């Protein structure tokens, strides 16, 4: 059965910025760092 129409690719990047006394600080983050992973795995798919 078509598993590809009913599953989605899961990858993501975000960043948080805050100004501390006229200086901007940015903090990037990735999805594997949030999921408890250390290595970026690229095969996995989420059922929607």
């Amino acid at each position: 059965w078509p598993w590809h129409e009913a599953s989605t690719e899961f990858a993501y990047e975000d960043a948080y910025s805050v100004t501390i006394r006229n200086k901007r600080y940015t903090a990037e983050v990735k999805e594997f760092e949030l999921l408890g992973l250390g290595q970026r795995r690229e095969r996995v798919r989420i059922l929607k």
Binding site: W1, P2, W3, H4, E5, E9, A11, Y12, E13, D14, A15, Y16, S17, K30, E31, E42
Partner: protein, 39 residues
């Protein structure tokens, strides 16, 4: 060493779906999507 070349060239009994689609999509990876800007 024990060769496996004769055992290597086999074939799997192919059998058709009820619904087509999702064929050439085996090896593709797009870039990760970003988040919205925060303020």
């Amino acid at each position: 060493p024990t060769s496996m070349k004769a055992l290597d060239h086999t074939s799997i009994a192919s059998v058709a779906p009820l619904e087509r689609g999702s064929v050439d999509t085996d090896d593709r990876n797009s870039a990760p999507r970003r988040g919205a800007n925060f303020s």
